[PDB]
Amino acid sequence: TLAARIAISNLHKQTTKQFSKVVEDLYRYVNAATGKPAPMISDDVYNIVMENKDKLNSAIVYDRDFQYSYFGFKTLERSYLLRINGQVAERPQHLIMRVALGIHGRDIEAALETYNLMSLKYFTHASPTLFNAGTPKPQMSSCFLVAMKEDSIEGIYDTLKECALISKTAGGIGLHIHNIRSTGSYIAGTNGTSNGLIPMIRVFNNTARYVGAFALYLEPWHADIFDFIDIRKNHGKEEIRARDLFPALWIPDLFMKRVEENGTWTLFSPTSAPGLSDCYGDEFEALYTRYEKEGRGKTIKAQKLWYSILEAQTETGTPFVVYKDACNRKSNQKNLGVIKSSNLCCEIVEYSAPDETAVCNLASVALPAFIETSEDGKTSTYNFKKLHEIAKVVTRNLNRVIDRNYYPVEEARKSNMRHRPIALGVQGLADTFMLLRLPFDSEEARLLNIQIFETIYHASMEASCELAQKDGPYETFQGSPASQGILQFDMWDQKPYGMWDWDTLRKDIMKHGVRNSLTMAPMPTASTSQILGYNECFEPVTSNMFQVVNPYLLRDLVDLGIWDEGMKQYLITQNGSIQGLPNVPQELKDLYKTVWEISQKTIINMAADRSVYIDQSHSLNLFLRAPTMGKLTSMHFYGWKKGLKTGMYYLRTQ
Amino acid sequence: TLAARIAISNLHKQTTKQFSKVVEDLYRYVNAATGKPAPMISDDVYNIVMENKDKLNSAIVYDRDFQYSYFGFKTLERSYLLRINGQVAERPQHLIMRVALGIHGRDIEAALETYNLMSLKYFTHASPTLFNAGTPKPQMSSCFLVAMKEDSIEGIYDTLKECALISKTAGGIGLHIHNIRSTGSYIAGTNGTSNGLIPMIRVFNNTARYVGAFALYLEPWHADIFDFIDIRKNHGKEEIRARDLFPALWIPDLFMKRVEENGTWTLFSPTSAPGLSDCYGDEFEALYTRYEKEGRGKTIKAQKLWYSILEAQTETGTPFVVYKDACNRKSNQKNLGVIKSSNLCCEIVEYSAPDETAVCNLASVALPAFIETSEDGKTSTYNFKKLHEIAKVVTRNLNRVIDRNYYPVEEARKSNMRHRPIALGVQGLADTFMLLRLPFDSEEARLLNIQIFETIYHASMEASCELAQKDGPYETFQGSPASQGILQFDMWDQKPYGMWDWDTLRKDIMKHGVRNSLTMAPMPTASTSQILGYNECFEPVTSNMFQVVNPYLLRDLVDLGIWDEGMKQYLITQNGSIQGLPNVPQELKDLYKTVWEISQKTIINMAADRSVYIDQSHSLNLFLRAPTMGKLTSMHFYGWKKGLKTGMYYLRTQ
């Protein structure tokens, strides 16, 4: 309330004004108890700041620190700001200037531009980038896609070592394991069987606790599939669980079909059925069927599996669902080979192999920051031209990061330097609709959703083409969909919406290439969108509220008189909902529909809409009343036929 | 009873007589369910057998199969004999012939000699050697001494990988970790502390379950010492335990002194106090003291630690105790550097480093097999000349193994090919005393103990010198104690007992060198001594008994009439003891004293006696009535001042 300005001003008093000196102190820092020099600034940036201190110092507007809300700021204080002896040594403006420097280096102009735009809350980078940009070993990447190196104790243990090295930095991990033999499989030069995936998973669970959570990806034909999906079950059978990892399903179309037509589904060990995961679509279904005929696996009723999956999803919120064929059919990285997993949050879709660990850097544009009253006043509209301009900057930022990143494992560096994937997202979609007074489920919200993503995708590809004009295309550009002028929406066999000129862009892409093989992967924004004060990513609100009420809701309630006590009381004891409320104008009830009150068919529709402008995928959480087995089935099947890549992230419940 | 000959004869009927054809089948074996060729014989041995089948086939005396006792044989059946489809395919004589071939290869003479001696129960090799000799990848080594590679996630994870690779074969492991930083130590490029050894130990616990148990060695100055010693406590605090690993203490003299004089004892993290474990004796105590002065650690009352250690030992039977300074002062491997651990069973004492994993092969001579009635009859004496002759063979066997072994990790191969350690032990010491009617605690038992070990040590060094005459000394012989003619007893500053000529031997050792840097490490015999029907290693009996009574006890009881029912009943309800029994001749009571009834001062004495003829160390289990804190202290301090290497293995209780 008045608490934010209390908390912030007190930071100002126990904090040196003058960025150049705070840099000096951070860089000079020394661990008191150990006597060890422990710089929190890189040599590289310290120097830059020193050779420019007056220019840097006077660019900072410390006014801007007061713009975070109490809980927003305390998020920064608790985690993001650099500490000395447990004492905050960084102002929010220092944080930002440092991050800018860590990205742009000697490009002072760009650095100030990034600074200004971030300080004004036009956009922000992901948490790893906020933590580490400008610091000695800047691990700024958020995502790592890891291939299980080989079905052996060496391969497994080499992979575990690699995950430890990754997770120790700020790295989230998606790990696919389709090549690990199942329970009871033969092991040369022994006499006892194999105990399958679960024990091996216990090992990874254990390494995560010791050290970036893990998601594990598995296709549903793997013989250990029934236990795998139940990892997070809290009525655990104990040594058969793994409460700290996440099951994600890598689902082929064939499975969905088998389920649908109430048919059979055969389980295999990778050893008995090689190559399943190194092909997709038709090639897979030809290979699959043959292995079925040849008796290599164990056939079941497909709907038994489907049923179990639903039971785990209902009970635990997992496994996630990501459709393997959508991902490979519609990836600009398909010239690299078959993609075998997504990531921790199911938005990244990139090629990984034993020698190549996929990496991504994330940033999110703040959608509401482009809302403005038109040339008159009776409106407030949306400035797609500014949105376009900022996306071009974020695209350049994210690309700079590729080069200035400290890579934890050589596999990650090899992978990223070759293909240069990038991932832009959004926060404040639900705010944006609310400021324009568009219900989430409305035809204008549907329209605006489409438009926003077309300009972000266009702008990013435009920035990226411009970069390829400067530095050449990424190593593997030749032979990709984009080199032919196939873009994301084309692969969904759709015409773009037309707000921007795609023909010219496509012309230059074919002529000059693009610096980045991918650019768009709407991610969970979480902590960053609490810093900025907006709603998570692209989702609607979960509730409109000695608590904190929705600000736009509040404005409206007050503006109509009906805000008071026997009123306030009503929302609290109604979990942020305003439906079935005695005296609220219908239009507010529709504008402030909470996600439990919005059709999921609508959610999926809009996801599908925007999906045509998404190089990769997006973290589609799904929300259910009291879940029902039939409703989940309808939900998944709707999204699958909608051609979604990520059919589901979490299944949020009740 | 008559059950053994029942069980054995039935094996004969479901088993092909003719070793050459059983080899054929094993070598031809194929996994029915998988269709995979799964040979259980190496190409190398299969061929040898084929080119000699008539010679091999007709050397086997299948009579000898009937000589194992029911429970002895069923030990072989349950674990040792090669199976086909869960069906025993090996006779005990095949097992042995195969093992012999796997060791000697094309040396058919030696192979038959090993066969004859083993089939007659003159000696046996350790279980890994019985499992794997002659098979495709023959991992015949029992012991692996592993250096923690480095205090980093890489080093730790590389070490874990290495232990997994080792433990997956038949390998037991001793792992020293004195270089791992403790709880709260600083970690460069992070903000949270270090959580110390216990979490890292949870990782190793977890890898042992997934895959050769682990013993972990730690010196008592390590800052995590109090939790480390409590690993096996069953009133666990849960995530602070590790119920599947064993704490062993690597104790410097300085600690014992500090305890003794009720003084201080300082704890360090390796990071704050480098080099502690890379020196010993005076060099250590100089370095230690300086770090004490310089305030680098946390000083305590030494007896607090001592007290806790006793509490864990009382409650769990661990930690084991192995005196680091005895081990380094009196090791022929001291020219290699400072020895940092023993092994899983506290008998191996060899140098290990990040690039060198110490390895050993074990065999045990059956002591009772050299007892014979003298040239007349009124005796039964001991044939030290035969004992000497057999030890020479076992020494040659164990040396052959060094060359024919498949090493699981390159570190192990590098280490063993350089130094060629060997480890001979014994079983049936308690039987031998009983057959000669010498109470364990008697002056003749004390004498015989000394003599037996002097000839085993002499014979082994003699065999080994002979081998060095054939093949040259081991790579690092020059500069060692032995190259100067210092032998084990010399390093205890004692004259040998004199039953064999040490001067000539020492002369030839100095002239020609020795093939093996070590030769003697009396180990737990366990399963092998149930196969052979004798008592474990060098320990006394634990009890003299719808059960099974001590055979020599029985002979005597019967021979005096007093054996019956109100008699039988008496031992059962007396846990194998015969003391305080109404009508037993005093001499039997002393001859059949159970280990709970034998003074531990005596045990330790004899250990010390034989210790002068032990290149390495021996697995000294200690046995207590109802333990007392003062008695344990007396026990340890007695052994320490006796100059024991392994002060204690398990603490057997009640």
Swiss-Prot record, chains A, B:
It is an enzyme of class 1 (oxidoreductase). Its main location: cytoplasm. Induction: Cell cycle-regulated with highest activity in S phase. Moderately induced by DNA-damage. The keyword Nucleotide-binding applies. One of its GO terms (molecular function) is identical protein binding. Belongs to the ribonucleoside diphosphate reductase large chain family. This is Ribonucleoside-diphosphate reductase large chain 1. Under complex allosteric control mediated by deoxynucleoside triphosphates and ATP binding to separate specificity and activation sites on the R1 subunit. The type of nucleotide bound at the specificity site determines substrate preference. It seems probable that ATP makes the enzyme reduce CDP and UDP, dGTP favors ADP reduction and dTTP favors GDP reduction. Stimulated by ATP and inhibited by dATP binding to the activity site. Inhibited by SML1. DTTP binds at residues 151-153, 168, 181, 188-189. Heterotetramer of two large (R1) and two small (R2) subunits. S.cerevisiae has two different R1 subunits (RNR1 and RNR3) and two different R2 subunits (RNR2 and RNR4). The functional form of the small subunits is a RNR2-RNR4 heterodimer, where RNR2 provides the iron-radical center and RNR4 is required for proper folding of RNR2 and assembly with the large subunits. Under normal growth conditions, the active form of the large subunits is a homodimer of the constitutively expressed RNR1. GDP binds at residues 127, 142, 343, 347, 525-528. The chain holds residues 76 to 746 of 888 of the full protein. Two distinct regulatory sites have been defined: the specificity site, which controls substrate specificity, and the activity site which regulates overall catalytic activity. A substrate-binding catalytic site, located on R1, is formed only in the presence of the second subunit R2. Present with 293000 molecules/cell in log phase SD medium. The active site is at 343 (proton acceptor), 345 (cysteine radical intermediate), 347 (proton acceptor). The record marks 143, 360 as: Important for hydrogen atom transfer. The modification Phosphoserine is found at residue 152. The record marks 649-650 as: Important for electron transfer. Its EC number is 1.17.4.1. GO terms for biological process: deoxyribonucleotide biosynthetic process. One of its GO terms (cellular component) is ribonucleoside-diphosphate reductase complex. It catalyses: a 2'-deoxyribonucleoside 5'-diphosphate + [thioredoxin]-disulfide + H2O = a ribonucleoside 5'-diphosphate + [thioredoxin]-dithiol. Keywords: Allosteric enzyme, ATP-binding, Cytoplasm, Deoxyribonucleotide synthesis, Disulfide bond, Isopeptide bond, Nucleotide-binding, Oxidoreductase, Phosphoprotein, Ubl conjugation. Disulfide bonds join 143-360. Optimum temperature is 30 degrees Celsius. Provides the precursors necessary for DNA synthesis. Catalyzes the biosynthesis of deoxyribonucleotides from the corresponding ribonucleotides. It is found in: Cytoplasm.
